[PDB]
């Protein structure tokens, strides 16, 4: 499972 706080700039729902 990715840690979404690795890079706050990354939105996982975004393509």
């Amino acid at each position, epitope marked *: *499972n*990715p*840690d979404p*706080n*690795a*890079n*706050p*700039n*990354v*939105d*996982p*729902n*975004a*393509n």
Partner: antibody
Amino acid sequence: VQLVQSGAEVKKPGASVKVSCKASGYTFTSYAIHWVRQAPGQRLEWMGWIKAGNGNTRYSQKFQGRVTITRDTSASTAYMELSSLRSEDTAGYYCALLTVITPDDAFDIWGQGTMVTVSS
Amino acid sequence: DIVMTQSPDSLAVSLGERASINCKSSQNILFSSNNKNYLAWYQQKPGQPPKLLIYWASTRESGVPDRFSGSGSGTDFTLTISSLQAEDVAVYICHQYYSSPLTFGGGTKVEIKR
């Protein structure tokens, strides 16, 4: 969108350096600013990031002791401080907006980077 | 830490020839939920910051020429330059953003044979 960094410097071993990074062209509080170092003949090393809004940070273990990243939102600028400098730390240093994958857009901006030489 | 391993270290092909760069992840970085690989590909010319080329392992960053493309899942990934131009001489770096800390590949140097 642009990040302009501070000038090259030499620092004596065991001393401290603090590189600046000014942001322009967007809402400074909206994005996280990263710092990555590149030492000659060595891969890119991520050092840490700071959310420019609430000033929350996250650091790397390899530098966790001696690194300090801060932002002055009034001046739209982020700062990174290495302490207890050694010879390993002679390297180029970058502030970066790494892989901002937003819904609307996707972009990746880096400063011109700043070289720090640790020497007597 | 997730370790990014690239092969080869160096490459040289003729102008117009195909170049292929493998990056292997030391831990799977595909998220089965959204079916997204959390990998980026970069290019670095001398005296310049790295420029981003691919993200989500296969999405070209806008502006980037079509001769660059990315592929692979899980732990194994390739960057493909279909027809090397003389300006493509650079170091290429894969990058994972699955986990802290963010890590980079060692970089592959493409050269021109002429």
